Each structure stands twice: as C-alpha cells, then as structure tokens.
Ligand binder design. Structure first.
Ligand code: HEC
Ligand code: HEC
Ligand code: HEC
Ligand code: HEC
Ligand SMILES: [Cl-]
Ligand SMILES: [Cl-]
Ligand SMILES: [Cl-]
Ligand SMILES: [Cl-]
Ligand SMILES: [Mg+2]
Ligand SMILES: [Mg+2]
Ligand SMILES: [Mg+2]
Ligand SMILES: [Mg+2]
Ligand SMILES: [Zn+2]
Ligand SMILES: [Zn+2]
Ligand SMILES: [Zn+2]
Ligand SMILES: [Zn+2]
Ligand SMILES: [Zn+2]
Ligand SMILES: [Zn+2]
Ligand SMILES: [Zn+2]
Ligand SMILES: [Zn+2]
Ligand SMILES: [Zn+2]
Ligand SMILES: [Zn+2]
Ligand SMILES: [Zn+2]
Ligand SMILES: [Zn+2]
Ligand SMILES: [Zn+2]
Ligand SMILES: [Zn+2]
Lengths: 106, 106, 106, 106
C-alpha cells in the first residue's frame, strides 16, 4: 500500500495499543504495524523526491524504519509473553522514532 | 515482487557481497537485500498457504525476516564505517538465517 | 562498580552527549555508557532485594539493560559514520529507557 | 569474573542448551550466558594488551559482545514463549559470533 496509507495504519494501531485491555488486542495491532513498516520500506517521501535514491537523506530515511521494525519486534515478544502493560509502554517508545523521522522528512 | 522474486534478489546479492572488492559494492548489495527482505514480509509461503494469516505458523515464519533485517542493518553500519572485511563476514551470519527459515518452511 | 556508581556514569555521560560539539566527545561518552550498562547487568536493585535471582521480576529488570545496550550500540554506529547530530538524538531514545526502568524498579 | 572464566560459562551453557529437553533447562542456561557476556564486556584479551583501549581492535572486540548479547536476548524471548526447538537453534546461531571473535582475538 502507499506511504500515507501505511502511516494511517501505524497511527490507528498505536492508538489501539494505548487503549487496549488485553494481550490479544495488543498483538493484533503490533502485527498490523509490523506489516505497515515493512511495506513503507521502499517508499520515497515527497520531500526527498529530487534526491538521488542513494543520497544520505534516503539512507537516513530507511534507517528510521530499521529502528521502528526493531522496536515492534521487541513489543511483540513482550505481548506474546503476556506482559501487556510492558508491550503497551514499548509501543510508547515507538513515538520517539515516529517523531525523529517526521522532524527530518515529513 | 513475489516471494520467489525476493529470494532470487537475496541470493544474487549475498553472492555479490562474498565476491566484492570494495565498500560501495557491499553497500549497494546490502541495500538491495534490505528492500527484498522488507518486501517478503507480506508473503504466504506454499507450506503455510492453508494457515490463517494471523496464525502462529505465519508469526513464526515472519520472525525469521526480523532476524535477517536486523543482520542487514548491522552489516550496512560496518560497511559505512569502512570495515569492509567485517561487513563481508556478516554474510556467514545471514546464511544461518536463510538456512533456518528454509529448513522449517520451504 | 555498584548499581549507584554505574547510574552516575550513565547520568554524567548522557549529559556529555547532549552538550557535545564533536564526534570524539560523543563516542567517548557512549563507550563509557556501554561499560556502565554491561556492569549493571549483575546488580539486584533495592526493590527486588528479597526476590530470588532467577525470578521473573529480576528477568524483567535486566530486560531494560538489553534495550539500553542495543540503543548505545546503534548510537555509536551513527557517531562512527560521522552522523553526530543523529548520534546525539539517540539521547532522546536512551532517556525513555532510563525512565521506564526507574518507573518500575526505583 | 575473569574473561576465561566467562568463556567457560559460555561454553558449558551452549552445550547444556544443545542437549536440553525442556524450556526451563534452556532459559536457565541462556540467563547464565547473558550474565557471562555482560561481565566479559570490559575485559582486555591477551592479544590486544599492547593496543590502546580506544584502538579499532578493542572497539571491534567489544562489538562482538553487542552481537552475542543481542542473540541471547532473542533466544530468551523464544524460550519464554515456549518455543524450545527455536530457542535451541537460536543458541546455535551464537556459534558464528563465538568463531568470528576467536578468529580475530583468541
Ligand atoms: C520515516 C522513517 C518515518 C517513520 C519511522 C514514521 N513516519 Fe509517519 N510519516 C513519514 C513521512 C515521510 C510522512 C509524510 C508522507 C507524505 O506523503 O507527506 C509521514 C506521515 C505520517 C502521517 C500523516 C499521514 C497523512 O497525512 O496522510 C501520520 C499520521 C504518521 N506519519 C504517523 C506515524 C506514526 C504513528 C509513526 C510511528 C509509529 C510514524 N508515522 C513513523 C515518515 C515516517
Ligand atoms: C523465511 C523467513 C525465509 C528467509 C529468512 C529466507 N528465505 Fe529463502 N525462501 C523461503 C521460502 C519459503 C522459500 C520458498 C518459496 C517458494 O514459493 O517456493 C524460499 C526460497 C528461496 C530460494 C529459491 C530456491 C528454492 O529451493 O525454492 C532461494 C534461492 C532462497 N530462498 C534464498 C534465500 C537467501 C539467500 C536467504 C538469506 C540471505 C533467504 N532465502 C532467506 C523463506 C525464507
Ligand atoms: C533498569 C534497567 C535501569 C535502567 C535502564 C536505568 N536505570 Fe538508573 N537506576 C535504576 C535503579 C534500580 C536505580 C536505583 C538504584 C539504588 O540502589 O538506589 C537507578 C538509579 C539511578 C540514579 C540515581 C538517582 C536516584 O534517584 O536513585 C540515576 C542518576 C540514574 N539511575 C540514571 C540513569 C540513566 C541516565 C539511565 C539511562 C541512560 C538509567 N539510569 C537507566 C535502574 C535503571
Ligand atoms: C569476543 C568478542 C569473543 C566472543 C563473542 C566469544 N569469545 Fe570465547 N574467547 C575470546 C577470547 C579473547 C578468548 C581468549 C582468552 C584468553 O585469555 O586467552 C576466548 C576464549 C574462549 C575459550 C577458551 C577458554 C580457556 O581456554 O580458558 C572458550 C572455551 C570460549 N572462548 C568459548 C566461547 C563461546 C562458547 C562463545 C560464544 C557462545 C565465545 N567464546 C564467544 C573472545 C570471545
Ligand atoms: Cl529514529
Ligand atoms: Cl533465524
Ligand atoms: Cl525499556
Ligand atoms: Cl560477530
Ligand atoms: Mg498526501
Ligand atoms: Mg513485491
Ligand atoms: Mg562493578
Ligand atoms: Mg589463560
Ligand atoms: Zn526484549
Ligand atoms: Zn513470537
Ligand atoms: Zn521500555
Ligand atoms: Zn531516533
Ligand atoms: Zn538472479
Ligand atoms: Zn553493530
Ligand atoms: Zn548508515
Ligand atoms: Zn558524576
Ligand atoms: Zn542503525
Ligand atoms: Zn564500530
Ligand atoms: Zn525475536
Ligand atoms: Zn522475557
Ligand atoms: Zn534462527
Ligand atoms: Zn560476526
């Protein structure tokens, strides 16, 4: 799906996780976030359209997705161990990654 | 690209990294492998075609791509700090990951 | 060094990274933080002093050091590839980790 | 404890994991390996005694422990999810890391 579509999926699921009561709700939302982040990997954002695809900007753009994907991987291990409150707080650590990439490229 | 397409990209670029004589050749191959791994995220392999998407078999299948994506992340940091022998030796690491997923799911 | 000693090292070096003007100053501070985090691995904090060592509370306590050590690993790769603004911004990432463990266990 | 003492702990526990039948045996051994790797962080190996502590050799020596500690972190998540055979195979991925550091520094 397109970069904005993936960002809506990330946004909607981060809010689901915040409001969640149980591990099943949290696991399902993190699974959707993992798929959206992986799908966004290859996107070129509008502000980097005129850069070479090998520019340090596009390199640093993709580095943000490595950080986000790694954080979702850990949050899912914590949810699958039944540590719901820990998985929810780990989902809050995602916000810094969201903000760092937005600050530079949104 | 379909799973088989992404796999040929991973296979071709893993070979380039083993044969490479300079950092630019390793970096280019690692970047292509990262794109192929992220794009493979969404695929259902033939052995799991009749498993539900949000099943445990599909969760366990996708976990191998988190491992691979993390190994490519590290290899690219080694290549970009000029440690090209070290970056190439990351290939021995990636191959174990390739082999574990194939043993279970191919 | 005891836990309190390691914590002062983490606190002092996190400040150096925020104030740093060059890569060498950030790298030196990150290396000191990595040594302090690894050395804190073995500590039993006051709130868990009466929990068994191989208990779940102590496992959950030590998991925060895996997160911190992983964040310092990435920040040092960013500093060593010359991305010093990016390396300093890793401080916002580390501080979340500091705060999550303190909220639960301090 | 000293570097050789930590290496005996890593060796003995890697063999325990290989021979293990259940998740409790695997979890206990990985926990011991996590403590030994963290304790070995700050060691200077005999072959790098005459190098500066900031040499790229000592930097690359410590990088191996980041890789090992990360791999033990994942293996423990897999054991705590009850995926015993996956945790055992993840423990086998440690061998490449063992060999890469030994090849250079043992
Ligand atoms: C870069 C590596 C990013 C990360 C990590 C995240 N986002 Fe993002 N986001 C990014 C860009 C380049 C853009 C702009 C896209 C455009 O075409 O203009 C965005 C945009 C969003 C939006 C707005 C979507 C819209 O208006 O249609 C949202 C709501 C959003 N991003 C949310 C979001 C969240 C919740 C993230 C982490 C969990 C996150 N993004 C990460 C680049 C990057
Ligand atoms: C799961 C997480 C996998 C990882 C990691 C890697 N591979 Fe893979 N690969 C996987 C599957 C399920 C399949 C079969 C796909 C199908 O529809 O047939 C494959 C296939 C290959 C092939 C094709 C040859 C074959 O015998 O089918 C190749 C050449 C291949 N994969 C290479 C490869 C490499 C080099 C990897 C790591 C660097 C790698 N794969 C990882 C599942 C997974
Ligand atoms: C658990 C995994 C922790 C992480 C990660 C960090 N800290 Fe910590 N810190 C922790 C404990 C249990 C304690 C109390 C120790 C005691 O015996 O009293 C502390 C203490 C501190 C202190 C001392 C001040 C206080 O109010 O007790 C400081 C200044 C401190 N920690 C700083 C710090 C920083 C900067 C961290 C991340 C970069 C950090 N800590 C992580 C447990 C854990
Ligand atoms: C560097 C980053 C290393 C990693 C990762 C591992 N080992 Fe190691 N090991 C390392 C050095 C520098 C040495 C030599 C120490 C010396 O003082 O000469 C070793 C040694 C060992 C030994 C021999 C111990 C002895 O003879 O007393 C063993 C059995 C050993 N190492 C096992 C081992 C295993 C099982 C590892 C991964 C699971 C591993 N080591 C990682 C440096 C590094
Ligand atoms: Cl980030
Ligand atoms: Cl794997
Ligand atoms: Cl944390
Ligand atoms: Cl290694
Ligand atoms: Mg738009
Ligand atoms: Mg495709
Ligand atoms: Mg100490
Ligand atoms: Mg000796
Ligand atoms: Zn974890
Ligand atoms: Zn899992
Ligand atoms: Zn946390
Ligand atoms: Zn960041
Ligand atoms: Zn080909
Ligand atoms: Zn690294
Ligand atoms: Zn980079
Ligand atoms: Zn001080
Ligand atoms: Zn990185
Ligand atoms: Zn380095
Ligand atoms: Zn994992
Ligand atoms: Zn755990
Ligand atoms: Zn594996
Ligand atoms: Zn290696």
């Amino acid at each position: 799906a397109d970069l904005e579509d993936n960002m809506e999926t990330l946004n909607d699921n981060l809010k689901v996780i915040e409001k969640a009561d149980n591990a099943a709700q949290v696991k399902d939302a993190l699974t959707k976030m993992a798929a959206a982040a992986a799908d966004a990997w290859s996107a070129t954002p509008p502000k980097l359209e005129d850069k070479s695809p090998d520019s340090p900007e596009m390199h640093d753009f993709r580095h943000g997705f490595w950080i986000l994907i790694g954080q979702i991987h850990d949050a899912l291990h914590l949810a699958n161990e039944g540590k719901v409150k820990d998985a929810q707080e780990a989902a809050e650590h995602l916000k810094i990654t969201c903000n760092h990439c937005h600050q530079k490229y949104r």
